Each structure stands twice: as C-alpha cells, then as structure tokens.
Write an enzyme that holds these catalytic residues in place. Structure first.
Site, short mmCIF file in Angstrom:
data_model
loop_
_atom_site.label_atom_id
_atom_site.label_comp_id
_atom_site.label_asym_id
_atom_site.label_seq_id
_atom_site.Cartn_x
_atom_site.Cartn_y
_atom_site.Cartn_z
N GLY A 9 0.79 -1.21 0.00
CA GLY A 9 0.00 0.00 0.00
C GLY A 9 0.83 1.27 0.00
N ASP A 47 -3.81 -13.21 3.10
CA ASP A 47 -4.99 -12.42 3.40
C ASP A 47 -5.05 -12.26 4.91
OD1 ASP A 47 -7.76 -11.62 4.00
OD2 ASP A 47 -8.20 -12.23 1.93
N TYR A 136 -15.79 3.31 7.42
CA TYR A 136 -14.36 3.20 7.75
C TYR A 136 -14.08 3.78 9.15
CZ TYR A 136 -9.38 4.20 7.46
OH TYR A 136 -8.05 4.28 7.71
#
Length: 308
Positions: A9, A47, A136
């Site tokens: 990321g 994951d 979120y």
C-alpha cells in the site's frame, strides 16, 4: 524480525524501505495479498483475515514486531461496508490475538476518520467523543478500542497514530478520499490537466509521507512509560484546501484544474480541517519537517523525473 502487513500500500511501500534502512534488509518481512514480480524484500503472501496462514507466517519467522498497515480505506468502505468491516476489524483481531500468543510489539494505526462533525473541526483535540459518519470511521473507533483493550487486559505494547491525509509520489493514486492531493500532483506534471473529485474549498489535515513514516518510527522507539496514549495519537502537519494546493503546484507547473465532486466529498465533509497533536509533541517529541513548499518541491522534482 519485523513484519509489515499491507506492505504493498501507499504507506507500506515506504515503511518497508525505512525499516530496512533502520534495522537491516534481512530483518524485514513484507506481507500482502499477492506477491509482485521481482519484489525487493522478503515477502509472505497472506490475506489478513486468514488466521492460520497469518499464524504460520509469524510462527515460522520468529516475528517480534508487527507494523499492521493492511486496511480497506474510507472510499472503498462506503462502497462495500461488509468488506471494510471484515478486513479492518477481523484482520486487526487476528493481529492482536497473534501478538498476545507470540508476545509481540505492535503498530496499529487509526485515522482522522474517527472524528465526526459533533466535535470541533479546527484543532480537534485528542480526547473528544468519537461519532464518525463513515463505515471506515466506525471500524477505526472499534479498532482503537480493541487495541487499548489488548494493552489493558493482555499487556500488549500496541501503538498507533490517527493518520491524516498522506501525500506521496512513490505509490500511484489509490482512488481514496484524500487521494485528490496526490492525483493533483501526478496529473499536473503528466498532462497539465486535473479533474478534482472534491470541491475547491475541501480542507483536510495533510502530511507528506516522509513525515508520517518518521513519526511512526519515532513513536515505536519511544520509552513505553513516556506514552500517555497508545493506539490513537492525533498527529498533525498541514491543513489546506484543494485550491490552495492547486495554487502551490501552479507556481511550478502550468496546469488547469477543474472541480467535479463525487461521493468522496460527503466523506471529506464529515472530517476535521485540522488536528491538535499536542500529546504527540509532548510525550514523544513529534515535530513535522515538511511544509507545503518543501513537499511540493519533492513531489514535482520526482514526478518530472518519472515523466522524462
């Protein structure tokens, strides 16, 4: 050994490098969903929701510290709330339980998304009520609470920062809510044209990546008895509107900016303009180094280079 989840990321990309430089390249394991070709660090695919793989990785590698950056961010989460909860809440729980089992030290970040419009928008204080208006945001409050539970009940040294909007050039725009800041630099330099997805006055707390990565390392280095907060330090550098950024960029680069808001506006509108981070400044010596000038010099210098 040190593990970084979400290593691919925006943040993880630069955090891996900085941890390699600080500790040695041999001490860092990157993890994320898919192994990229010709990757430059040891990598274990996982994951974050898969506890038996995640367990195995931590077991097999003798991980003592985890920087947990795996997450579904605000924009993606409004679109798919189920996925946002599953990854952010259950993933985090997997990290926490595993830290307890293996006695690990943790960095588990939060977000300025924990804040809603029921508390001050200017210089939001550390200890206000948390009533977020996003999916979120809600996951991040629950995460802060889980982390602080693990601290209280299980003695896990877990630490975190409520990251503001982060600007970088080393990762490409990820379609996120704060990503208008990054996209504006890239499109300005590449094509002289940008369509901004928030309105021109949209004003958020922002920080250049170097500062955010440094803050993360500094916090992780601090003596534990110096910290009055654990999972959720406010952290501040800049606050500016989208047009103010356009004006700064235009001092280097001719470009025409058009404003066409979309659903991300309604996320950004529920967040503060600026953040009171005195506790970070006090407890562990935080000070940012990149103002909007110096940030835009780095961004444009490097983007120009990439577009030669």
């Amino acid at each position: 050994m040190i593990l970084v989840t979400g290593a691919l990321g925006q943040i993880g990309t630069e955090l891996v490098l900085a941890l390699q430089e600080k500790y040695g390249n041999d001490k860092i394991i990157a993890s994320d969903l898919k192994e990229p070709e010709n990757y430059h660090c040891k990598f274990e695919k996982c994951d974050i929701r898969d506890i038996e793989t995640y367990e195995r990785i931590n077991n097999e590698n003798k991980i003592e510290i985890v920087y947990h950056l795996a997450a579904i961010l605000s924009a993606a989460g409004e679109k798919n709330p189920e996925l946002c909860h599953d990854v952010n809440y259950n993933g985090l729980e997997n990290v926490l339980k595993t830290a307890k089992k293996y006695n690990q030290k943790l960095f588990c970040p939060s977000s300025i998304a924990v804040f809603g419009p029921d508390v001050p928008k200017e210089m939001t204080p550390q200890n206000v009520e948390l009533n977020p208006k996003t999916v979120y945001g809600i996951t991040k409050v629950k995460g802060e609470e889980l982390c602080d539970t693990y601290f209280k009940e299980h003695g896990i040294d877990v630490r975190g920062i409520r990251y503001p909007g982060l600007i970088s050039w080393k990762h490409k725009p990820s379609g996120g809510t704060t990503d208008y800041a990054v996209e504006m630099y890239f499109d300005a330099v590449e094509s002289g044209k940008y369509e901004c997805f928030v309105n021109r006055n949209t004003r958020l707390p922002m920080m250049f990546m170097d500062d955010a990565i440094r803050a993360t390392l500094e916090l992780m280095d601090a003596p534990l008895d110096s910290l009055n907060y654990h999972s959720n330090y406010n952290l501040s550098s800049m606050s500016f509107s989208a047009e103010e950024l356009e004006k700064e960029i235009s001092a280097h680069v001719d470009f025409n900016c058009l404003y066409k808001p979309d659903y991300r506006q309604d996320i950004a509108d529920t967040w503060p303009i600026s953040i009171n981070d005195d506790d970070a400044r006090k407890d562990w010596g935080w000070e940012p180094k990149f103002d909007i000038s110096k940030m835009t010099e780095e961004m444009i210098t490097n983007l120009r280079r990439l577009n030669e």
